[PDB]
Amino acid sequence: PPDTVLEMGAFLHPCEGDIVCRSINTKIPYFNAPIYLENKTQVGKVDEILGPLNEVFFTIKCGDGVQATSFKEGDKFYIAADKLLPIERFLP
Amino acid sequence: DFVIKPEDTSEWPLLLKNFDKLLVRSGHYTPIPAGSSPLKRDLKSYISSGVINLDKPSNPSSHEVVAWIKRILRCEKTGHSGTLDPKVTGCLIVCIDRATRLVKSQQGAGKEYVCIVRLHDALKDEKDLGRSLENLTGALFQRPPKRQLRVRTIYESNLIEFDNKRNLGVFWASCEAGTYMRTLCVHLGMLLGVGGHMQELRRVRSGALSENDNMVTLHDVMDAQWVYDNTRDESYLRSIIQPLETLLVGYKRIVVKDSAVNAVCYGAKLMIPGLLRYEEGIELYDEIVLITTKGEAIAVAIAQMSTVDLASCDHGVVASVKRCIMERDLYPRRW
Amino acid sequence: MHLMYTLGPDGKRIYTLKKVTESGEITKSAHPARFSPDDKYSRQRVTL
Known part of the structure; x- marks a missing residue:
């Protein structure tokens, strides 16, 4: 239900009930940021953030009724603009 | 014997290993029987x-x-x-x-x-x-x-x-x-x-x-x-x-004259007249170790002069103490 | 514990999960023996 949602992750694979995504955003998501499909249905929230600076990955804790195993490689996941941090926040 | 004489060192221990490669500001110093080479403490x-x-x-x-x-x-x-x-x-x-x-x-x-x-x-x-x-x-x-x-x-x-x-x-x-x-x-x-x-x-x-x-x-x-x-x-x-000198073996070294050791400990600055020998490749603001002629770590210091300046300068501060290690009155006060 | 080692020609550790290396060497635990400060066996250890 945000007015606009931004591309955030591309499906990599499930991991023990979570969705693992490769980031397709230049910015870092807030912990627990709602994560949506393109049509803006919420499917979970950001759990873990990991990976090197130039290839971040993140996990999605799936919401009620959402199964990690139901998605396929390259399926996109989205985030509100106001739930992103510039990477410079984490660097010296 | 492992003390720089007031006059091959690859087997010399710890901070004096290869001290012959240090550049020489002064060939002489008046020795003071204070302190000890680390292994002989x-x-x-x-x-x-x-x-x-x-x-x-x-x-x-x-x-x-x-x-x-x-x-x-x-x-x-x-x-x-x-x-x-x-x-x-x-x-x-x-x-x-x-x-x-x-x-x-x-x-x-x-x-x-x-x-x-x-x-x-x-x-x-x-x-x-x-x-x-x-x-x-x-x-x-x-x-x-x-x-x-x-x-x-x-x-x-x-x-x-x-x-x-x-x-x-x-x-x-x-x-x-x-x-x-x-x-x-x-x-x-x-x-x-x-x-x-x-x-x-x-x-x-x-x-x-x-x-x-x-x-x-x-x-x-x-x-x-x-x-x-x-x-x-x-x-x-x-x-x-x-x-503890074992922990400092990676540091570029400056050797201080016996008569200047106490002053370094108290005043937190090494001056040119206190300088005996110094490592090649020291650049301004490099973290270095100041050592005695017996190889004791006096302090970790910040170089206030490059190696090249240390050769050509007649006066001024050569290094500033970041952390003093040696006990302040191990070596005797000049006054 | 699972982490094992043997010594290489340089005197440095080569780590492994194996209990015997390809060479036939029986591997040692990478971790030191348990210590408790009431250990009674200084005299025995030092004379041995």
């Missing part, structure tokens, strides 16, 4: 300027371990090179008394680990572990196990062995202080899809010392004190305790 001052390269066993905390050493040695102060979790073994640098002044540097230094990751299922392509380990080298995002996202660097890593049936991988990693192997293991599991956690962990290098550099056990420490208490033979204590 009397037992009490040897221990009080001492460091133990300890192989921490699995189960006690680093704090527990350091308390045990203090009780054994009956020393005034102990501190260490960075907390190994209770189950983690290996290199824990225990600083005694005056050596405690070097704790902060030891804790901020890089570390090396050998780690076993336990994967939660077999991999189909066994080579995927090595690939994901390589993927997770560099400046990495880690949230510490109230906890903020941060970046820590894994400089290099190497997969040593992987048993896909036992679901166990053993790897080596060189990292920045504060990098969590526990979190790396989780992350490897996520990148691999099967999931994972850290099975066990050993620290194989902590900054200046590795597990190959006269690492000793708690049993060694207890036994060394026992032999001294019962037979008054110092040799076991001297074998297991290393001079």
